[PDB]
Amino acid sequence: GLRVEEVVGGLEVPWALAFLPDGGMLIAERPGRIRLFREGRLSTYAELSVYHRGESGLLGLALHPRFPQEPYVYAYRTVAEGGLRNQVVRLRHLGERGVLDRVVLDGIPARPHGLHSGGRIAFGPDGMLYVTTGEVYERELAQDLASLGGKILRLTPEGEPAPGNPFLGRRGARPEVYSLGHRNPQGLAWHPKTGELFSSEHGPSGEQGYGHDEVNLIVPGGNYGWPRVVGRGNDPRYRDPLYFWPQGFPPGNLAFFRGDLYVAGLRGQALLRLVLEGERGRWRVLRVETALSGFGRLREVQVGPDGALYVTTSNRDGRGQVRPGDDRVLRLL
Amino acid sequence: GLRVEEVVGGLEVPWALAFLPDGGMLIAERPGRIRLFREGRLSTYAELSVYHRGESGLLGLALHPRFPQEPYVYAYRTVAEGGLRNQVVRLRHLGERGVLDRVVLDGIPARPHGLHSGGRIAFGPDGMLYVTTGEVYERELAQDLASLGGKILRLTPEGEPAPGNPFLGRRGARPEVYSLGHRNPQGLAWHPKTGELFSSEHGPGHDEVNLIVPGGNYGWPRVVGRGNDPRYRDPLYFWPQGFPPGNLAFFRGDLYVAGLRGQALLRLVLEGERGRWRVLRVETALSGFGRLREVQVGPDGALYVTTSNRDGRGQVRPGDDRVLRLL
Ligand SMILES: [Ca+2]
Ligand SMILES: [Ca+2]
Ligand SMILES: [Cl-]
Ligand SMILES: [Cl-]
């Protein structure tokens, strides 16, 4: 049994967390504010102009692998100035505040409705920047190697296509693409033992079928089926998910904690624990258990430097029930 | 991989740790001192008279299940005054100090050589007190139901044989006995999911980890190693070339075993279910600190370990015998 304790509340859709080496904590609020929680006080680290409609705005957040030597905080945001699109930007760290440094990758698909913008970013064991993107409700983008939408991208911290990427030599293909065939993926997590990448993504919603949200084991160049395939199939061209909920469980981020894979649930309003059995390249879920419930919609989930599991609530994202002090950062054990 | 940091040092054979709900930490030093480490300061909580020779002295330590409302600290110790034997004594908690309340269980075997005195005590998920005892180098005692030696005992916090014990209605058997056929057992840990009790003990090599079941006979000294005799329970894990273990604890999904002569903390990756467990693989989680004896998960989620380099069988180094904290 995991014990919960509230770290801080009153936040508006805390999409991602970043743990500063000195103990502080950066919190990305979808409306466009990056908050700093330190010594029991909440302050504004930075304010960024964003397009906050639908599921868009200020989404993923990640510190440079060599932070603070390389004083840089990365953020994924939907912007409208000069044209509506998603992008990954970088801010220069000044201690208690951050200021826009430059755009790292621009032109990721976005639409006026603000739906399916993806947004999860994180630096992997290889030191590269991984970025999830949605197909903005134009499902065919996911299968289009020429589109940055419905993909998982991999870049160097400077924004260049990562060396060794799967489509580096092909004409008509975006060299930034790591994997394709993804609807709206928002999770990124690496298995501590194998280094394998796992991702979570929302399945169809009266959008070609209901439920079938999933957790995928991401391999370089892998095509995860959307929109050609929903759930599992017999087609070897498209990789089946490690697990999927035929009755839908729309997922937030996911993280490895104590040998198990935890998945934050948004509509399901719960934190699920996936018990795995297998080895590199051969995993399967033995059983699924509820690790947390009674706190509403859950979106971000990360293991902190203290070894504790941090989770954020999403009750104020327009699809939940807002209650006093809502949208907290919770610490489990 | 785990990351370590020293909590405090300069200790003399810190045998067991007890975490105070308020934040403090009690440390049992074999020579007979219970220390209090609170807000960065080390002090003496209590000083008990003990017989500290061989592997004996002040050994296991455990707070009452309802501490501090039930202000009581349990300690296992070898005493010479009034006769040489091992016992579980209770102290009244007074804040920064603890004083002698009463003996909870007396008469556990002890011998002048001070070897094989067991000593690990802990309250289980059932709220009962579990006590490990050695056969004081008189191996036959382990198979003798009339002897408190070479056993794991289970009592109520008041010292009465725990209700439901396996040999309650057995002529010629100490009602306190929970399991028998131990050689020297100084390890107690319960699986977080199943509530099953796991124990570690020293054998000639043949050190092992056992899944303790009520009434189980663990073979010493009739059988060592695995076999398939319904009378005896096989060990969960057996060390062919011999790791002498300290305590063990479940941490972040795995079972960790402190190694004394092995000078390392081993991680046992388990696979199976309630009643049928097996060790998938064994890995080293910590080393470079010498002999390791106590291992317990703290309230802060970190795994605590103690060194035992000053117990007479290791290499002592400046500041040696510390309490370490892992991630
Ligand atoms: Ca799929
Ligand atoms: Ca045995
Ligand atoms: Cl969303
Ligand atoms: Cl010993």
XYZ file of C-alpha atoms and ligand atoms in Angstrom:
664
model
C 0.000 0.000 0.000
C 1.276 3.431 -1.025
C 0.720 6.380 1.307
C -0.182 9.772 -0.128
C 0.788 13.239 1.040
C -0.021 16.521 -0.678
C 3.039 18.499 -1.723
C 1.197 21.528 -3.115
C -2.188 22.397 -4.603
C -4.239 25.101 -6.283
C -2.543 24.407 -9.629
C -4.288 24.588 -12.998
C -3.576 21.359 -14.872
C -0.004 20.542 -13.727
C 1.102 18.736 -16.887
C 4.719 17.898 -16.054
C 7.238 17.994 -13.210
C 10.980 18.685 -13.184
C 13.162 18.121 -10.126
C 15.927 20.669 -9.620
C 19.251 19.376 -8.239
C 18.990 21.787 -5.293
C 15.656 20.355 -4.175
C 13.300 22.759 -5.915
C 10.552 21.553 -8.236
C 9.335 23.003 -11.535
C 5.669 22.527 -12.395
C 4.265 23.204 -15.857
C 0.671 24.487 -15.771
C -1.144 24.111 -19.095
C -2.356 27.757 -19.133
C 1.265 28.772 -19.725
C 2.952 29.159 -16.330
C 5.986 27.222 -15.103
C 5.820 27.301 -11.310
C 8.646 26.821 -8.834
C 7.867 25.090 -5.555
C 10.669 25.431 -3.029
C 10.756 25.493 0.767
C 6.971 25.452 0.986
C 6.556 28.425 -1.353
C 5.060 28.623 -4.839
C 6.454 31.198 -7.246
C 6.459 31.819 -10.988
C 9.600 30.515 -12.676
C 8.467 31.698 -16.095
C 5.394 32.714 -18.026
C 5.069 31.633 -21.649
C 2.515 32.684 -24.244
C 0.579 29.597 -25.282
C -2.570 28.618 -27.158
C -4.680 27.134 -24.405
C -7.731 25.619 -26.062
C -8.758 21.978 -26.090
C -5.881 19.805 -24.854
C -3.213 22.330 -25.897
C -1.075 24.949 -24.132
C 2.052 24.450 -22.024
C 2.670 20.717 -21.841
C 5.901 18.730 -21.433
C 8.872 19.928 -19.384
C 12.418 18.580 -18.967
C 15.777 19.786 -17.667
C 18.876 19.541 -19.865
C 20.765 16.297 -19.056
C 23.734 18.356 -17.816
C 21.652 20.908 -15.889
C 22.715 23.364 -14.509
C 26.140 23.337 -16.234
C 24.020 23.623 -19.363
C 21.437 26.025 -17.810
C 18.501 24.969 -19.944
C 14.907 23.956 -19.247
C 13.002 22.386 -22.137
C 9.282 22.830 -22.654
C 6.713 21.677 -25.211
C 4.066 24.286 -26.040
C 1.281 25.140 -28.469
C 1.813 28.688 -29.751
C -0.349 30.969 -31.914
C 1.951 33.943 -32.566
C 3.031 33.898 -36.203
C 1.004 30.776 -36.871
C -0.641 28.034 -34.824
C 1.672 25.093 -34.151
C 3.360 23.038 -31.442
C 7.056 23.427 -30.671
C 9.763 22.530 -28.212
C 11.475 25.561 -26.744
C 14.370 26.005 -24.357
C 14.630 28.522 -21.496
C 17.846 29.789 -19.912
C 17.969 29.039 -16.176
C 18.756 32.075 -14.015
C 18.234 30.491 -10.615
C 14.766 31.440 -9.391
C 13.536 32.291 -12.891
C 13.874 31.225 -16.498
C 13.727 33.177 -19.749
C 13.064 32.030 -23.300
C 16.335 31.117 -24.990
C 15.238 29.727 -28.350
C 12.978 27.326 -30.233
C 14.493 23.831 -30.399
C 12.024 22.291 -32.867
C 9.213 24.223 -34.542
C 6.301 23.214 -36.759
C 4.783 20.259 -34.932
C 1.121 19.975 -36.009
C -1.587 21.838 -34.096
C -5.150 22.778 -35.070
C -7.657 25.413 -33.856
C -9.558 22.802 -31.863
C -6.384 22.164 -29.854
C -7.008 18.418 -29.678
C -4.391 15.672 -30.023
C -1.264 17.767 -29.485
C 0.744 15.075 -27.679
C 3.294 16.985 -25.627
C 5.346 14.680 -23.396
C 9.095 15.278 -23.514
C 11.976 13.672 -21.664
C 15.664 12.907 -21.988
C 16.397 9.199 -22.180
C 19.297 7.014 -20.933
C 21.080 7.849 -24.183
C 20.986 11.554 -23.359
C 18.680 12.291 -26.290
C 15.458 14.307 -26.255
C 12.298 12.284 -26.880
C 9.099 14.084 -27.906
C 5.569 12.707 -28.287
C 3.158 14.349 -30.743
C -0.500 13.890 -31.628
C -2.023 13.721 -35.105
C -4.326 16.675 -34.351
C -7.429 14.653 -35.274
C -6.142 14.128 -38.825
C -5.422 10.432 -38.347
C -3.499 9.964 -41.609
C -0.644 12.115 -40.314
C 0.457 9.277 -38.011
C 1.412 7.071 -40.974
C 3.005 9.924 -42.926
C 6.788 9.921 -42.436
C 6.772 13.472 -43.817
C 4.628 14.687 -40.906
C 5.876 15.376 -37.370
C 2.422 14.425 -36.056
C 1.377 11.127 -34.487
C 5.018 10.363 -33.750
C 7.663 9.980 -31.098
C 10.654 12.087 -32.099
C 14.257 11.816 -30.939
C 16.643 14.761 -31.040
C 20.008 15.800 -29.641
C 19.705 18.380 -26.841
C 20.491 20.995 -29.499
C 17.453 20.055 -31.577
C 19.133 18.158 -34.403
C 17.835 14.747 -35.520
C 19.495 12.197 -33.226
C 22.315 10.238 -34.858
C 21.269 6.685 -35.595
C 17.609 7.646 -36.058
C 15.681 5.066 -38.185
C 14.774 7.294 -41.149
C 17.888 9.444 -41.427
C 18.597 8.481 -45.028
C 15.121 8.165 -46.546
C 13.813 10.887 -48.867
C 10.493 12.476 -47.946
C 10.850 11.414 -44.314
C 11.391 13.726 -41.332
C 14.789 12.717 -39.881
C 13.517 13.536 -36.378
C 11.096 10.578 -36.397
C 11.860 7.738 -33.993
C 8.521 5.880 -34.158
C 5.214 6.425 -35.978
C 1.599 5.282 -36.012
C 0.641 6.971 -32.740
C -2.695 8.686 -32.054
C -2.093 10.980 -29.083
C 0.818 9.638 -26.999
C 1.558 11.508 -23.769
C 3.773 9.104 -21.857
C 7.480 8.246 -21.905
C 9.267 5.893 -19.517
C 12.437 3.789 -19.672
C 12.804 0.371 -18.040
C 15.604 0.735 -15.436
C 17.151 -2.651 -16.243
C 16.872 -2.910 -20.030
C 16.780 0.729 -21.098
C 13.759 -0.067 -23.267
C 11.327 2.781 -23.969
C 7.669 2.427 -23.012
C 4.922 4.843 -24.000
C 1.252 5.373 -23.205
C -1.379 6.790 -25.519
C -5.085 7.531 -25.806
C -7.118 5.124 -27.898
C -10.117 6.064 -30.155
C -13.151 7.981 -28.684
C -16.164 7.823 -30.869
C -13.195 8.341 -33.128
C -13.213 5.122 -34.959
C -14.020 2.997 -31.919
C -14.038 3.549 -28.150
C -11.446 2.552 -25.502
C -8.377 0.509 -26.445
C -6.007 2.972 -24.821
C -2.576 1.394 -24.648
C 0.967 1.023 -23.396
C 3.545 0.350 -26.103
C 7.118 -0.936 -26.074
C 8.798 1.512 -28.454
C 11.503 0.277 -30.826
C 13.402 2.460 -33.334
C 11.480 2.739 -36.595
C 8.483 0.965 -35.100
C 5.024 1.649 -36.536
C 2.321 1.372 -33.917
C -0.683 0.997 -36.191
C -2.821 4.122 -35.773
C -5.149 4.564 -37.601
C -4.767 1.320 -39.580
C -4.933 -0.768 -36.407
C -6.770 -0.380 -33.095
C -5.719 -2.678 -30.263
C -3.973 -5.882 -31.332
C -3.788 -7.350 -34.824
C -2.275 -10.116 -36.940
C -0.418 -7.631 -39.163
C 3.358 -7.819 -38.499
C 3.856 -4.404 -40.132
C 2.208 -2.794 -37.104
C 3.418 -3.520 -33.584
C 0.808 -4.521 -30.998
C 0.667 -2.772 -27.633
C 2.222 -4.328 -24.537
C -1.196 -3.845 -22.970
C -4.477 -2.170 -23.864
C -7.831 -1.566 -22.185
C -10.693 -2.677 -24.443
C -12.777 -0.792 -21.936
C -10.974 2.492 -22.199
C -8.425 3.820 -19.726
C -7.216 7.160 -21.103
C -3.642 7.486 -19.821
C -1.483 10.338 -18.677
C 2.222 9.647 -18.242
C 3.707 6.385 -16.961
C 6.764 5.504 -14.892
C 8.758 2.563 -13.576
C 8.599 2.386 -9.789
C 9.639 -0.545 -7.588
C 9.926 -3.018 -10.450
C 6.438 -2.271 -11.748
C 5.058 0.006 -14.455
C 2.670 2.658 -13.129
C 0.180 4.380 -15.419
C -1.716 7.542 -14.478
C -5.362 7.424 -15.460
C -7.259 10.495 -16.552
C -10.892 9.472 -17.135
C -10.367 6.343 -15.021
C -9.301 8.588 -12.135
C -6.738 6.107 -10.833
C -3.080 5.130 -10.794
C -2.660 1.588 -12.091
C 0.226 -0.771 -11.405
C 1.196 -3.136 -14.222
C 3.045 -6.247 -13.061
C 5.441 -7.377 -15.771
C 7.010 -10.736 -16.542
C 9.662 -11.378 -19.150
C 12.911 -9.997 -20.493
C 14.209 -7.463 -23.017
C 12.073 -7.676 -26.146
C 9.679 -10.141 -24.505
C 7.382 -8.543 -21.928
C 3.791 -9.210 -20.913
C 1.505 -7.989 -18.152
C 0.842 -10.592 -15.457
C -1.733 -8.498 -13.627
C -3.030 -4.952 -13.223
C -3.709 -3.453 -9.789
C -5.019 -0.109 -8.555
C -2.285 1.747 -6.668
C -4.186 4.983 -6.056
C -7.798 6.157 -6.273
C -10.105 8.781 -4.810
C -8.152 11.815 -6.025
C -9.767 12.428 -9.399
C -8.063 12.539 -12.795
C -4.328 11.776 -12.734
C -1.868 13.018 -15.369
C 1.842 13.317 -14.534
C 3.765 10.560 -12.746
C 7.505 10.540 -12.077
C 9.951 9.036 -9.622
C 11.613 11.798 -7.622
C 15.299 11.993 -6.571
C 14.131 10.827 -3.144
C 12.898 7.564 -4.631
C 9.295 8.600 -3.998
C 6.615 8.526 -6.701
C 5.124 11.899 -7.659
C 1.725 12.244 -9.308
C -0.354 15.247 -10.385
C -4.118 15.651 -10.678
C -5.927 16.985 -13.740
C -9.385 17.794 -12.387
C -9.294 21.318 -13.790
C -8.527 20.394 -17.410
C -12.155 20.795 -18.451
C -13.016 17.099 -18.305
C -13.366 16.635 -14.565
C -14.981 17.792 -11.348
C -13.163 20.691 -9.715
C -12.981 20.668 -5.929
C -11.265 22.958 -3.365
C -7.472 23.000 -3.545
C -7.723 20.941 -6.722
C -4.904 19.879 -8.959
C -2.203 18.960 -6.599
C 1.198 17.405 -6.790
C 1.002 14.226 -4.713
C 3.903 12.277 -3.236
C 3.491 8.527 -2.739
C 5.803 6.982 -0.135
C 21.349 0.932 -8.744
C 21.063 2.150 -5.162
C 22.889 5.200 -3.813
C 24.296 5.309 -0.291
C 24.910 8.025 2.284
C 26.156 7.730 5.860
C 23.728 8.640 8.630
C 26.008 8.300 11.642
C 29.194 6.472 12.573
C 31.440 5.702 15.518
C 29.070 2.946 16.656
C 30.044 -0.410 18.142
C 28.266 -3.279 16.401
C 24.865 -1.618 15.731
C 22.771 -4.789 15.825
C 19.290 -3.403 15.232
C 17.395 -0.210 14.400
C 14.008 1.046 15.610
C 12.359 4.049 13.950
C 10.509 6.382 16.311
C 7.207 7.723 14.893
C 8.244 11.248 15.898
C 11.347 11.033 13.720
C 14.070 9.673 15.971
C 15.988 6.425 15.622
C 17.034 3.935 18.299
C 20.213 1.936 17.737
C 21.129 -1.196 19.678
C 24.893 -1.539 20.175
C 25.899 -5.089 21.112
C 28.071 -3.963 24.045
C 24.830 -3.042 25.815
C 23.927 0.521 24.850
C 20.757 1.690 23.149
C 21.539 4.937 21.363
C 19.180 7.655 20.219
C 20.021 9.501 17.033
C 17.688 12.470 16.689
C 18.019 15.788 14.853
C 21.605 14.947 13.950
C 22.712 14.201 17.513
C 23.873 10.896 19.012
C 23.121 10.135 22.665
C 22.586 7.216 25.030
C 18.925 6.248 25.421
C 19.653 3.403 27.820
C 22.548 1.316 29.089
C 21.801 -2.310 29.852
C 23.886 -4.875 31.674
C 24.688 -7.629 29.168
C 26.990 -10.592 28.671
C 29.031 -9.429 25.695
C 31.277 -12.302 24.667
C 31.279 -14.221 21.409
C 28.198 -13.169 19.448
C 26.176 -12.269 22.550
C 25.194 -9.063 24.337
C 22.463 -6.591 23.366
C 20.902 -7.827 20.142
C 17.405 -7.329 18.723
C 15.308 -4.201 19.272
C 11.651 -3.436 18.503
C 9.053 -0.857 19.515
C 5.682 -1.956 20.866
C 3.115 -2.171 18.015
C 1.189 0.741 19.558
C 4.180 2.878 20.580
C 4.266 5.451 22.143
C 0.720 5.205 23.551
C 1.993 1.855 24.809
C 5.399 3.375 25.801
C 7.517 0.243 25.493
C 10.710 -0.806 23.732
C 11.555 -4.518 23.466
C 15.155 -5.735 23.482
C 16.779 -9.150 23.235
C 19.849 -9.561 25.419
C 22.232 -12.098 26.898
C 22.571 -11.637 30.677
C 24.850 -13.211 33.281
C 23.366 -11.788 36.488
C 21.175 -14.374 38.173
C 22.307 -17.012 35.712
C 23.545 -17.052 32.125
C 20.726 -16.954 29.576
C 19.099 -14.957 26.788
C 15.882 -13.011 27.331
C 13.511 -10.474 25.855
C 13.254 -7.507 28.214
C 10.898 -4.544 27.978
C 11.860 -0.947 28.743
C 9.508 1.934 29.523
C 9.954 4.761 27.006
C 10.374 8.133 28.723
C 11.251 10.362 25.776
C 15.035 10.617 25.460
C 15.544 7.789 27.925
C 14.236 4.280 28.429
C 14.276 2.376 31.712
C 13.772 -1.273 32.644
C 10.128 -2.316 32.861
C 10.098 -6.116 33.133
C 11.346 -9.321 31.510
C 8.878 -10.526 28.864
C 10.464 -13.923 28.171
C 13.360 -15.372 30.151
C 15.328 -18.601 30.020
C 16.411 -18.725 26.390
C 19.597 -20.813 26.077
C 22.976 -19.083 26.336
C 26.436 -20.504 27.037
C 29.743 -19.022 28.264
C 31.226 -19.063 24.745
C 28.416 -16.693 23.766
C 27.923 -18.236 20.322
C 24.637 -18.946 18.532
C 22.369 -16.757 20.679
C 20.077 -15.745 17.801
C 18.655 -12.386 18.848
C 16.440 -10.916 16.112
C 13.050 -9.671 17.291
C 10.223 -7.912 15.479
C 6.467 -7.467 15.563
C 4.691 -8.975 12.575
C 1.622 -7.823 10.578
C -0.425 -9.821 13.089
C 0.814 -7.620 15.907
C 2.664 -10.509 17.557
C 6.291 -10.612 18.730
C 8.613 -12.908 16.767
C 11.930 -13.988 18.311
C 14.835 -15.895 16.761
C 17.045 -18.039 18.999
C 20.184 -20.071 18.365
C 21.013 -23.566 19.589
C 24.114 -22.309 21.420
C 26.303 -24.795 19.536
C 24.340 -27.727 20.973
C 22.674 -28.618 17.676
C 20.294 -31.247 19.035
C 18.385 -28.482 20.820
C 17.003 -27.233 17.488
C 14.973 -30.431 17.041
C 13.877 -30.517 20.683
C 10.401 -29.003 21.075
C 11.090 -28.740 24.800
C 13.946 -26.293 24.150
C 13.661 -22.603 23.342
C 16.909 -22.842 21.366
C 17.223 -23.141 17.596
C 13.722 -21.747 17.135
C 11.620 -18.813 16.025
C 9.137 -17.963 18.766
C 5.879 -16.032 18.594
C 4.354 -14.283 21.605
C 1.782 -11.610 22.353
C 3.258 -8.224 23.306
C 2.777 -9.306 26.934
C 4.850 -12.450 26.539
C 2.149 -15.104 26.434
C 2.411 -17.819 23.776
C 0.639 -16.306 20.774
C -2.916 -17.588 20.222
C -3.020 -20.053 17.354
C 0.623 -21.101 17.796
C 1.392 -24.523 16.210
C 2.308 -26.502 19.334
C -0.191 -25.163 21.863
C -1.818 -28.553 22.358
C 1.365 -30.619 22.276
C 2.741 -32.420 25.340
C 6.452 -31.838 25.875
C 6.584 -28.722 23.696
C 7.194 -25.086 24.624
C 4.000 -23.277 23.543
C 6.064 -20.273 22.430
C 7.568 -22.237 19.528
C 6.515 -21.110 16.050
C 9.123 -22.957 13.967
C 12.074 -25.216 14.773
C 15.161 -26.808 13.240
C 17.153 -23.581 13.079
C 20.918 -23.364 13.570
C 21.442 -19.644 14.089
C 18.669 -17.410 12.729
C 19.040 -13.630 13.005
C 16.707 -12.355 10.301
C 12.977 -11.612 10.121
C 11.053 -9.964 7.272
C 7.475 -10.104 6.015
C 6.502 -10.029 2.343
C 4.579 -6.723 1.797
C 1.983 -8.399 -0.416
C 1.407 -11.834 1.119
C 2.313 -11.237 4.752
C 4.502 -14.352 4.617
C 7.456 -14.438 6.997
C 10.974 -14.824 5.618
C 14.068 -15.487 7.708
C 17.823 -15.733 7.287
C 20.260 -17.838 9.293
C 23.872 -19.018 9.479
C 24.847 -22.643 8.880
C 28.299 -24.253 8.658
C 28.697 -22.689 4.335
C 25.046 -23.523 3.804
C 23.737 -20.149 4.996
C 20.159 -19.609 3.821
C 16.913 -17.685 3.557
C 13.748 -19.519 4.604
C 10.037 -19.042 4.046
C 8.775 -19.625 7.603
C 5.430 -21.428 7.991
C 3.676 -22.140 11.316
C 5.042 -25.351 12.810
C 7.665 -25.693 10.096
C 10.775 -27.750 10.863
C 13.773 -26.384 9.006
C 15.972 -29.466 9.306
C 18.996 -28.457 11.389
C 20.938 -30.542 12.138
C 19.345 -33.559 10.406
C 19.486 -32.059 6.923
C 21.282 -29.148 5.265
C 20.479 -27.951 1.770
C 17.490 -28.947 -0.347
C 15.653 -32.251 -0.463
C 12.079 -33.493 -0.544
C 11.256 -34.848 2.907
C 7.792 -33.652 4.032
C 9.109 -33.478 7.614
C 11.508 -30.694 6.678
C 11.045 -27.386 4.889
C 13.502 -26.558 2.105
C 15.235 -23.146 2.094
C 14.041 -20.460 -0.330
C 17.671 -19.747 -1.187
C 20.819 -21.640 -0.244
C 24.414 -20.397 -0.522
C 26.688 -23.281 -1.680
C 29.942 -21.388 -1.093
C 28.502 -19.627 1.930
C 27.261 -16.135 2.717
C 26.816 -15.660 6.497
C 23.767 -13.370 6.532
C 22.630 -10.634 8.860
C 19.025 -9.457 8.693
C 16.896 -9.213 5.530
C 14.200 -6.823 4.370
C 11.733 -6.300 1.538
C 12.512 -3.104 -0.343
C 11.045 -1.671 -3.537
C 9.683 -5.055 -4.591
C 12.756 -7.169 -3.852
C 14.296 -8.996 -0.892
C 17.620 -7.638 0.357
C 19.997 -9.669 2.514
C 22.851 -8.178 4.527
C 26.081 -10.119 4.256
C 28.504 -10.330 7.155
C 31.547 -12.265 5.923
C 30.424 -11.484 2.374
C 30.677 -7.753 3.081
C 27.823 -6.877 0.763
C 24.103 -6.320 0.442
C 22.517 -8.816 -1.936
C 19.289 -8.370 -3.868
C 17.197 -11.495 -4.384
C 14.788 -11.099 -7.282
C 11.763 -13.270 -6.568
C 9.193 -14.893 -8.820
C 6.118 -16.899 -7.936
C 3.217 -16.487 -5.536
C 1.957 -17.141 -2.012
C 3.364 -20.528 -1.047
C 5.492 -21.088 -4.146
C 8.439 -18.696 -4.334
C 11.756 -19.049 -6.138
C 14.794 -16.836 -6.658
C 15.073 -15.590 -10.240
C 18.505 -14.046 -9.786
C 20.908 -12.721 -7.156
C 22.574 -9.322 -7.544
C 24.883 -7.170 -5.419
C 23.260 -3.888 -4.368
C 25.975 -2.495 -2.093
C 29.593 -3.184 -1.150
C 32.754 -1.449 0.013
C 31.624 -0.877 3.591
C 32.703 -4.159 5.111
C 30.488 -6.514 7.099
C 26.774 -5.660 6.974
C 24.307 -6.739 9.670
C 21.034 -4.844 10.127
C 18.841 -3.905 7.168
C 15.459 -2.227 7.540
C 13.173 0.034 5.541
C 12.623 3.403 7.188
C 9.414 5.521 7.356
C 10.975 7.872 4.800
C 11.034 5.058 2.255
C 14.815 4.636 2.302
C 16.573 1.349 3.091
C 18.804 1.483 6.174
C 21.836 -0.744 6.715
C 24.405 -1.058 9.504
C 28.023 -2.225 9.401
C 29.487 -4.795 11.776
C 33.235 -4.371 11.339
C 33.843 -4.052 15.084
C 32.189 -7.364 16.013
C 35.535 -9.138 16.273
C 35.463 -10.714 12.821
C 36.119 -7.740 10.569
C 38.587 -4.989 9.723
C 38.013 -1.827 11.737
C 38.463 1.557 10.082
C 38.177 5.123 11.438
C 34.552 6.001 12.113
C 33.734 2.383 11.367
C 30.402 0.726 12.129
C 27.958 3.294 10.749
C 24.289 3.440 9.849
C 23.861 3.862 6.109
C 20.856 5.072 4.135
C 20.165 3.813 0.613
C 18.193 5.983 -1.837
Ca -1.525 1.133 -31.573
Ca 17.828 -25.579 6.687
Cl -4.963 15.751 -22.818
Cl 26.398 -12.984 14.966
